[PDB]
Amino acid sequence: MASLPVLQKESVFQSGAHAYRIPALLYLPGQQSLLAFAEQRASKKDEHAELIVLRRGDYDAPTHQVQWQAQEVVAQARLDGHRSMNPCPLYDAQTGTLFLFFIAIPGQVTEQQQLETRANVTRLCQVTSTDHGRTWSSPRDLTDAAIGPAYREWSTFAVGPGHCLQLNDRARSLVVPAYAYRKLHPIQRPIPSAFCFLSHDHGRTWARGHFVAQDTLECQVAEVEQRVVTLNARSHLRARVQAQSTNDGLDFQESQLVKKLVEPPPQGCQGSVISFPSPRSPAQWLLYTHPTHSWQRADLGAYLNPRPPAPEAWSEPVLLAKGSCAYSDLQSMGTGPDGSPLFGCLYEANDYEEIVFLMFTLKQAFPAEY
């Protein structure tokens, strides 16, 4: 009945003059601190998104707790007349450049509208920072350099939401998970499909990798041991959809539904996935958070995959939170206070009226594996 006894559970965002949704969590291994991003809307309704907020949490080792600083708006992260949403932070380990990818949309134009009209008006933006988010650069509209030709082919699109991924490939590449509503039938409605924007020049230029099976929405990616990228996407189907890539994000194959990982009725809900050092045959294991209830968005659960990316390998969940739970984001924080893998979790709680930070170790969530 009781939720999982964690290392830490604290409300990091709450409604007030504004409502806060769509959480993102970035871990700076060298700072030993987290960057918590969220959307600051004038109300819970999507069409009311405005700016992106940020909070820095620095991990204290003596007490194994994370102390967060006052929330601030990533001012530079926005385009004139458009509202910003869907944050997708990434940290380029080598250039030390911190990236924040977001989507800018004109006025309060809805997503439904770009859909019904098959008219895309969504801009792809990013802002960078070299002092860990203290001062951001001026907004840079990537739409043309990242899209262009494929712009008319989509009714709309979006990045993440959630932390992006830098590969440990022969060139440490940037992979930004995303999904788009593609126009494939003159009569039938557009079908969304997950995919990743790739950058091999450290952000200089981009490229869109090929789509995966269709009817997949917001997804996230991870890398595992010969070196592959498993993707996990939100589907309007019974459960979650997941595919793997063996060419650094350019192609996703073996895509299939995973019934062990349920999805709420309508169009499902966003979820998060990360990889981490196996406590002992495979180099990495995966951890994934998503609501475990099947009629609604409640009971946030954590799932383990000790033999990735074998779909049947996925484990049964463990209750991280009882009640209303929605969008979440995960981060591997290294080795915890108890010698096991440390995890940082950010999730939408209490009917979108607060976003919570959760911190726990593998030994806590899945002690069985010991």
Ligand SMILES: CC(=O)N[C@H]1[C@H]([C@H](O)[C@H](O)CO)OC(C(=O)O)=C[C@@H]1O
């Ligand atoms: C850009 C945008 O409106 N994103 C919205 C997203 C989207 O509608 C869905 O992924 C299919 O397009 O859904 C949800 C949601 O709580 O289910 C909130 C997001 O704000």
